[PDB]
From a paper:
Met1-linked polyUb is hydrolyzed by deubiquitinating enzymes (DUBs) such as [name] or CYLD5–7. Using structural, biophysical, and cellular analyses, we demonstrate that [name] binds with high affinity to two distinct surfaces in the [name] [name] domain and thereby competes in a non-catalytic manner for cargo binding, retromer assembly, and endosome-to-membrane trafficking. While [name] catalytic function prevents an overload of Met1-linked ubiquitin chains synthesized by LUBAC, [name] also regulates [name]-dependent cargo loading, retromer assembly and endosome-to-plasma membrane recycling via a non-catalytic mechanism.
To unravel the exact binding properties and to explain the high affinity of [name] for [name], we determined the structure of the catalytically inactive [name] ([name]) in complex with SNX27PDZ at a resolution of 2.0 Å in the triclinic space group P1. The asymmetric unit comprised two [name]–[name] complexes that superimposed onto one another with an RMSD of 0.4 Å. As expected, [name] bound to the C-terminal tail of [name] comprising the PDZbm and did not affect the overall OTU fold (RMSD between apo [name] and [name]-[name] complex 0.9 Å). Close inspection of the C-terminal interaction interface revealed that the well-ordered [name] PDZbm engages with [name] in a canonical orientation identical to the described [name] peptide cargos like DGKζ. [name] His114, which was shown to be essential for cargo binding, forms hydrogen bonds to the peptide backbone of the [name] PDZbm and also to [name] Thr350 (-2 position in PDZbm), explaining the strict necessity of this interaction for complex assembly. Like all class I PDZbm interactions, the C-terminal Leu352 (P0) hydrogen bonds to the backbone of Tyr53 while the aliphatic side chain occupies a hydrophobic pocket on the SNX27PDZ surface. The interface is composed of polar and electrostatic interactions with the side chain carboxyl groups of [name] Asp90, Asp87, and Glu85 hydrogen bonding to [name] Arg100 and Arg68. Thus, while the canonical [name]-PDZbm binding interface is essential for the association, the second interface composed of the [name] [name] β-hairpin loop and residues Glu85 and Asp87 in [name] contributes to the high affinity of [name] and [name].
Residue numbers in the entry:
A (entry chain C): 40 to 134
B (entry chain A): 79 to 352
The structure:
């Protein structure tokens, strides 16, 4: 279900990986019995990093970043949004 | 009844279709972890005798941003009459289970199938977005007479190419290696034997053989790149038809879990660390 996890920039970075569609796309898929446009997902986590300690799990699909709905967003949209934050990162993810 | 099921994330497909840690499921999932480096999702292809043809055509047509020159070529629809007239044995053509006709009508049924292929491809190539094309293909691949008419067209194009390759071989021209293998089979020594004992049987007693994948690729001038999950950790894990693909041919990627179960990867991905 939806989970709002918070992670803080180490000077190393947030410490996972994000992977998802490059192009704009809205085709709906069934996830957990509900329909969603394509979602970016966590492709890797850094053991002993901010993401691992904070609670982000590999495979978690991202629904929001800093309260902004990224459902159906492009990879650059979410990445750029990730990098908009000064300090902190707030993610709403589905596990 | 979509013959190509709707999109599903690879993460969800494996969670559902390849549960457990048996060596088989583990192998499939490590294979899908490779597919997952380039795509996020897959669509399951109907596992009938046309599976390889359906996966290839769905991918090629849903990626169509233009009408390929060999399909746009207006001389293409003269090919059925010119070939059947030159080679009357082609009238041993066996129709798919969804059609029937008397051999007099063979020429115009093939021309009808070729016209359908061209029209659908042109229609898809005119649409502005890839998502719009996939929806249009979804309406096309409903397992009805139109979808299966396309296979009659492609199969006829495969026969024509095989005829051209055989003729080149006998005249002494250079031919691609796969053609030697194709006609080296005791059941397919010549194009007629290829028609009666293999092409005619796709849709009735089996699907395309491995080396007929080359013929299909040459027939629609598409490079067919197949993730063969059963051959993970080997050179054949990713097999390509043709083995040396021309740089101008468009590429379609398939996933063959086994030789009868095909998925198509969709939604190209890219990864960023953070």
């Amino acid at each position: 279900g939806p989970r709002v996890v918070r992670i803080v920039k180490s000077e190393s970075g947030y410490g996972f990986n994000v992977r998802g569609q490059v192009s704009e796309g809205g085709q709906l898929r069934s996830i957990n019995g509900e329909l969603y446009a394509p979602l970016q997902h966590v492709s890797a986590v850094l053991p002993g990093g901010a993401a691992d300690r904070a609670g982000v799990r590999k495979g978690d699909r991202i629904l929001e970043v800093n309260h902004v709905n990224v459902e159906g967003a492009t990879h650059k949209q979410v990445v750029d949004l990730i990098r908009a934050g000064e300090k902190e990162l707030i993610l709403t993810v589905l596990s | 009844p979509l013959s190509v099921a709707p999109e599903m994330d690879i993460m969800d497909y494996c969670k559902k279709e390849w549960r457990g840690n048996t060596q088989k499921a583990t192998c499939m999932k490590m294979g899908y972890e490779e597919v997952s480096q380039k795509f996020t999702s897959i669509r399951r292809v109907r596992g009938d005798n046309y599976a390889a043809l359906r996966a290839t055509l769905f991918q090629a047509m849903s990626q169509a941003v233009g009408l390929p020159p060999w399909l746009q070529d207006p001389e293409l629809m003269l090919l059925p009459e010119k070939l059947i007239s030159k080679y009357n044995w082609i009238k041993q053509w066996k129709l798919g289970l969804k059609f029937d006709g008397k051999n007099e009508d063979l020429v115009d049924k093939i021309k009808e199938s070729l016209t359908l292929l061209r029209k659908k491809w042109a229609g898809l190539a005119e649409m502005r977005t890839a998502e719009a094309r996939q929806i249009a293909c979804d309406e096309l691949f409903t397992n009805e007479a139109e979808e299966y008419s396309l296979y009659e067209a492609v199969k006829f194009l495969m026969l024509n190419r095989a005829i051209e390759l055989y003729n080149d071989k006998e005249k002494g021209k250079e031919v691609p290696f796969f053609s030697v293998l194709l006609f080296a089979r005791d059941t397919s020594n010549d194009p007629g034997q290829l028609l009666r004992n293999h092409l005619n049987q796709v849709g009735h007693t089996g699907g395309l053989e491995q080396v007929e994948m080359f013929l299909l690729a040459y027939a629609v001038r598409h490079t067919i790149q197949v993730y063969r999950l059963s051959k993970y950790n080997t050179e054949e894990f990713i097999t390509v038809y043709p083995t040396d693909p021309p740089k101008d041919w468009p590429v379609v990627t398939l996933i063959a879990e086994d030789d009868r179960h095909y998925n198509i990867p969709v939604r190209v991905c890219e990864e960023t660390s953070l």
